[PDB]
Design a protein around this ligand. Structure first.
Ligand SMILES: [Mn+2]
Ligand SMILES: [Mn+2]
Ligand SMILES: [Mn+2]
Lengths: 314, 314, 314
């Protein structure tokens, strides 16, 4: 199956900028080139051009509503289009807000998808529960069917229609959840593996169960949304909300490695890589590089080594 | 149950000072404030005033006997008093020597308690086996019943009466044990989980077994003595005896998270945080902060998130 | 059984030097002294004197053929000699090329030995598959019977005779394998435990299976070839090819600890410690020290503590 890289240089989902430079940093680290060398066809769609909506008045507490909604609508169109053509979409964020566009668009072509959310956060706050109107913490609230009508309509999101139910999303790496968000995941009965579960079961058992839970009765498309802050700050320091005690570089690669095994990866999001937040040039280099590794792992690169079939090396 | 923070700014249990500043650093990092925000009532008893015993002649090899004995006696009184009033005591050390006072005072009210000792060391040297008279390495030797009369009487400890048996203490994180101490833990048949066992079983199984061993037949009060050096020096660098290959920040939090689960925590010691040993300001900040996290974890803070009951967030 | 330390200050197996200083650094860190304090007799054979072969023309792509061959031949003689006298050989490299000499010499006396290869690389490239003639990446290619005659004769290795079969070597910590090398280990059906397997099973299960696979039917001599780059660069930074996501200090000691348990250790190689590659003096100190720890672990030092038998400490 061919791959379609799509850049989403957007940051209105959070206060300070920097995230819009994410895709540039990743491309500059030779993401696309390195991708080409695998058993997958690669096409770089380029970066979407986002327009700043004038006089974007804060909807109550929610900030930059119309811009984020506009951007997400434009993305969902592009995503759905490539998906329609039978390609796997790889979105380079950008902040978590863009996960609305990515998942939606993906759903229009594959309504039976499942989402595996690797993040240190749940990002399931609604316009009513947000302690800050920052939309990077609400993407999942806009997608859940069970949350339809549980919060007022936000200017710019009229086009969005809840495309997934609680029984279709699995969180991995949770370690910074708000009281409201915890009430939500508990009440709705969502399957999650926070750091304590990973500690208790080991990354192996976690993946073993997320799969039997999601791909139990019927094998369906997997949409992996990967927030770089799911790994410990010692690995991915250049992000907006780093939290200590995260997943290790090894754990991060084991996850993507098992995702490739299933052969059901349909959509991938590499979000939150903010190049201006790195304390030193090395910190940024470390962050960008680890993101690249995670992506390559998703598409065949294994740590035991690779090699072309039918070719004799001896 | 209410909480009673007690400061033990003592350091005579080891050569160089710095440890007496531990409680100041912890309070200064907002320990008490952060504690207040949980489902527990918090009362800060302040710092005990320790008097330096004049002409404290070294008892053979043991150094500062009368001072440490005096201090520990005073502490045990205070601990026992608060315990008597039905509160959970949280002692802020101070060096490991203060563990005598804390556990004793705790025992007077709850003689059926069990001690879980998270440390990189056993600290079970007796006056006869100590390679240095430093009392921070002998606390457990003064509490064990099976060691009663195995060593001469030390000036200042006449008030002490062995309160626990080998069958009531579990060590976690051992990785720097003296030949003598190893002979003692082996001969006495004490249950311990050194680093190799943690590697072999995983922190999960470790906790699972410490519990069935201790809380097997009857559920009793748990006294947690936590030496900051139980975690790797990359996490808690500001301490007297850091040893490489220790418990991770995640393993450290998993332990305390399981302790809270039992709902049997009755006494807690946060020892050995030495602010002057940090190579850089950041190193100290890291050490103090991780201690705070461990304490909050003991009292309800979970990594999956929290939230008040009866409150509707939607 | 007595121990015989043998120094192999050689570096012609790779481009830049530094590796020849490894044995000096290790001795200087008190390796031999610390060894003496265990339940093993220690004899330091000193460092072999290697002669530089004049006009060593590059055999096609392979560089420094006659020198490495000469060096390895001389080493094999010394190894075999001490082995012959019933002693355990401990070689201090030096780059991985010297693994040919060590293993061969060892086999002449114990032809039924098994090789446990802890490394981040397979080092199984043949003169035909090497992307660089550097011989530190080909040691295992010269020892495998299944690769006999699969590549031309290299000047200087006429004395070598394949001494092990694919069913006798187990790799641990693989994470930087060339396509050719992966074709080779796959086609030949070699047992390996790359980082993904370590992540999936835990170091415990890894050792549990390497043993039943190797020491299944008959207990035979174990030859442990330990490349310092098998551990994460945060532990052993001074080496030629560090790779992120390696084994931890704990995992490294757990392995050596289980090796001692079997009581079948017959030969040990501590390779690749390059003192000039350390970014700071501390980085070198860290590297050197961790190697020393690994060695001591192999010979009885346990993290739970040790103590002499028949001696009463109470
Ligand atoms: Mn996040
Ligand atoms: Mn300690
Ligand atoms: Mn290597």
């Amino acid at each position: 199956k061919p791959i379609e890289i799509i850049g989403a240089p957007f940051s209105k989902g959070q206060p300070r900028g920097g995230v819009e430079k994410g895709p540039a940093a990743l491309r500059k680290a030779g993401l696309v080139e390195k991708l080409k060398e695998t058993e997958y066809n690669v096409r770089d769609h380029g970066d979407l051009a986002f327009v700043d909506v004038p006089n974007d008045s804060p909807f109550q507490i929610v900030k930059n509503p119309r811009s984020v909604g506009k951007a997400n609508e434009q993305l969902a169109a592009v995503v759905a289009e490539t998906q329609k053509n039978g390609t796997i979409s790889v979105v380079l964020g950008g902040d978590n807000s863009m996960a609305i566009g990515s998942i939606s668009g993906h759903a229009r072509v594959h309504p039976d998808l499942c989402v595996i959310w690797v993040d240190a956060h749940t990002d399931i706050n609604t316009p009513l529960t947000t302690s800050s109107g920052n939309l990077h913490g609400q993407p999942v609230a806009f997608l859940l069917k069970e949350l339809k009508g549980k919060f007022p309509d936000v200017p710019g999101f009229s086009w969005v229609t809840p495309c997934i139910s609680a029984k279709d999303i699995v969180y991995i790496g949770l370690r910074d959840v708000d009281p409201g968000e915890h009430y939500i995941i508990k009440t709705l009965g969502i399957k999650y593996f926070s750091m304590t579960e990973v500690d208790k079961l080991g990354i192996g058992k976690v993946m073993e169960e997320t799969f039997s839970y999601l791909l139990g009765r019927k094998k369906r498309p997997i949409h992996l949304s990967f927030d770089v802050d799911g790994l410990d700050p010692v690995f991915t320091p250049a992000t907006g909300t780093p939290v200590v005690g995260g997943l290790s570089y090894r754990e991060g690669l084991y996850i993507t490695e098992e995702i490739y095994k299933t052969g059901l990866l349909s959509g991938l999001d590499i979000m939150e890589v903010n190049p201006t937040l790195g304390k030193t040039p090395e910190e940024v280099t470390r962050t960008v590089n680890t993101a690249v590794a995670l992506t390559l792992s998703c598409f065949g690169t294994k740590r035991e080594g690779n090699h072309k079939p039918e070719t004799d090396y001896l």
